[PDB]
Amino acid sequence: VDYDDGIDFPYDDPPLVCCFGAVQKEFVPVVRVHDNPMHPDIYSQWKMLQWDPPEFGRAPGGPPSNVAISHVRLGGRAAFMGKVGGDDYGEELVLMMNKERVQTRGVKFDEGASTACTRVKIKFEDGKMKAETVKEPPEDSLLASELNLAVLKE
Amino acid sequence: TSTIPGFNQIQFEGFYRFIDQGLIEELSKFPKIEDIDHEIEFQLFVETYQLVEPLIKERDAVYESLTYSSELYVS
Structure with missing residues (x-):
């Protein structure tokens, strides 16, 4: 098993980076309890x-699309590899990528799901409220058959 | 602390302090008043101090050339 692009030119001078995963406009995954609340x-x-700030929050990371944008703006080249919805917000996120000159050939476009929207069923167990995901969002549901192998090659 | 204060706040917090304590403070210094024959006595019961709102609104007071003022009553 192998994949051939049929091209022999040396790509381009700043080598490409592929950033895999999810895209959100801005979103902090690393959250922990902090000692000092300000007014609610x-x-x-x-x-x-x-x-x-909290020490875990002294330099938050975010979505890998943030890293793609920053890397391109620092002069490199980034491709973002992921999936978005066909809705207006997936278009807004791809437009954000394109305007930042992030290469979006691996960005797929699910038509039957709503970008950031995750379906969850709220349940009660042990008397506590809980959620379970009924449907994953587009960005969580990129398939292994939707990878862009030209990007992974470059 | 976190932000540029409201510029009028120095006046605002001053005036509220005048209402929040200066009325009690100054009315508390009003003495008992005694007549010349030492038989009749008058005093304000400062605990009953009551500012009723201005019966005339600002935009009427400025038009009629009046003072926009609350009325202090005491028993």
Whole structure:
């Protein structure tokens, strides 16, 4: 088993990076309990928690699309490999990628799902409320047959 | 702390302090008043101090050339 592009030119000078996974406009995965809440409603004071922040939150990472954008803006080349919905927000995220000159040939476009929207069934167990995912979002549901092997080659 | 204060807040917090304590503070210094024959006596019961709202609104007071003012009553 092998894959051939039929091209022999040396690609291009800043070598490509492929960023695999999910795209969100901005989204912090790393969350933990912090000691100091500011006021629960006044967002005008949460600056105090971006200048004296939790230590896990001192330099948050985010979606790999953030890394793709930053890498391209730092002068490299990035391809984002992932899936988005056919809805307006998936278009907005692909447009964000394209305007940032992130290469989106591996970005698939599910037509029957709603980008960020995950279906979950709320359940009660041990008297606690719980959720279970009934349908995964597009960005969670890229198949191994939807990989762009030209990107993974480059 | 986190943000540029409201510029009028220095006035606002001053005036509210005047309402929140300066009325009690100054009315508390009102003495008992005694007549010349030492038989009749008058005092304000400062605990009953009551500012009723201005019966005339600002945009009417400015038009009629009046003072926009609350009325202090005491028993």
